[PDB]
Amino acid sequence: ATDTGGYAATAGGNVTGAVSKTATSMQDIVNIIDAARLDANGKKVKGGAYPLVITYTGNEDSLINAAAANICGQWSKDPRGVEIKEFTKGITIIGANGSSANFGIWIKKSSDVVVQNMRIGYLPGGAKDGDMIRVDDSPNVWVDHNELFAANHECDGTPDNDTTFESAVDIKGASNTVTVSYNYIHGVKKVGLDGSSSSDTGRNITYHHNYYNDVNARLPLQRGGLVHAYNNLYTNITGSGLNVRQNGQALIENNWFEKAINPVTSRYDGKNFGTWVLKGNNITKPADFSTYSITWTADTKPYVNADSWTSTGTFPTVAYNYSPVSAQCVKDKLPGYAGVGKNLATLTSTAC
Ligand SMILES: [Ca+2]
Numbered sequence: 001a002t003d004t005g006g007y008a009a010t011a012g013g014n015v016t017g018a019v020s021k022t023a024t025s026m027q028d029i030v031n032i033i034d035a036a037r038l039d040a041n042g043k044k045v046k047g048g049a050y051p052l053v054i055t056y057t058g059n060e061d062s063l064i065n066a067a068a069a070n071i072c073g074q075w076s077k078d079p080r081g082v083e084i085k086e087f088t089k090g091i092t093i094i095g096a097n098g099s100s101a102n103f104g105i106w107i108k109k110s111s112d113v114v115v116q117n118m119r120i121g122y123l124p125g126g127a128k129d130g131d132m133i134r135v136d137d138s139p140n141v142w143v144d145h146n147e148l149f150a151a152n153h154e155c156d157g158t159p160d161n162d163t164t165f166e167s168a169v170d171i172k173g174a175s176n177t178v179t180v181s182y183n184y185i186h187g188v189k190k191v192g193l194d195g196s197s198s199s200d201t202g203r204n205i206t207y208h209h210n211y212y213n214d215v216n217a218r219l220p221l222q223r224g225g226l227v228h229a230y231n232n233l234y235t236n237i238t239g240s241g242l243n244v245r246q247n248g249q250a251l252i253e254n255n256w257f258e259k260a261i262n263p264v265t266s267r268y269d270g271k272n273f274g275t276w277v278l279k280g281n282n283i284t285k286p287a288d289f290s291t292y293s294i295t296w297t298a299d300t301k302p303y304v305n306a307d308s309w310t311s312t313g314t315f316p317t318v319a320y321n322y323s324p325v326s327a328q329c330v331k332d333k334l335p336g337y338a339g340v341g342k343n344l345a346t347l348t349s350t351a352c
Pocket of ligand 1: 130166
């Protein structure tokens with residue numbers, strides 16, 4: 001079906017007439033997508049000729065392990081990534097169990113794209129937009145059951161001292177409806193934007209059942225629009241979590257926060273603070289902060305923290321259908337449903 005448990009409604013390339021192809025390498029993925037633009041007469045078709053389901057069986061563990069050992073040598077290398085540009089027939093890139101990639105997936109001006117069961121880590125090119133997953137001007141995209149990692153560390157002498165490694169999942173432009181679910185993101189400094197600038201506001205994005213561990217900031221850095229974050233497990237957040245900016249609205253429900261600094265804020269602009277609706281999280285009142293090691297800090301410019309742990313605005317009726325489990329169930333069970341090799345398993349109340 002087209003249900004993603006979020007704003008994105010897609011089946012990807014898992015539709016009628018889909019052509020199934022197996023990619024053994026990054027280059028195969030590129031050659032496969034390219035060939036999919038040609039019709040029966042060998043002539044290009046705008047948006048692609050047919051739907052695709054690409055099963056990636058490649059393994060680049062040697063690159064990953066080599067990079068994991070020399071963290072500071074990555075930012076200056078050439079970035080590596082597969083570009084899914086202007087492909088709208090529907091496409092699904094799914095990793096075979098045991099596969100891995102030291103390259104990213106950059107989606108641009110496309111639609112109905114599903115990325116599943118991919119293990120991407122320690123990407124090169126942090127100083128040259130070496131994102132793991134980029135969703136740009138692309139509606140109906142589903143980023144599900146992936147493991148995205150690097151090192152939550154900033155080396156010295158990197159451009160802007162913020163380029164050791166780029167982001168895990170950056171969303172920007174007219175990527176109007178996106179669902180980011182069941183991903184295991186760890187060891188990442190900049191998790192992901194939701195608007196590339198003050199002017200790039202909007203979109204409806206859902207983050208659910210994601211497991212974040214040892215991440216510094218941007219969970220996401222929201223620029224306007226709506227963000228619905230439910231059933232996520234946030235732990236070891238070393239900087240800030242959800243940063244709601246430019247009057248964006250967020251519904252933060254049934255998540256589990258632990259060992260986090262500034263879990264819900266609106267900072268760095270000094271104005272146009274966003275709002276949030278808090279409900280059913282493990283934290284219910286300020287008393288719980290001490291219980292789960294939640295600390296807050298101030299900013300040099302005007303900011304708004306959720307230290308009173310109260311709702312500061314409203315949120316529209318959540319269009320889609322979804323069944324959130326309790327905050328405890330997430331904390332207990334989520335680590336077994338998030339990531340690669342979980343056969344795309346989902347967490348339900350019955351499993352609680
Ligand atoms: Ca980026």
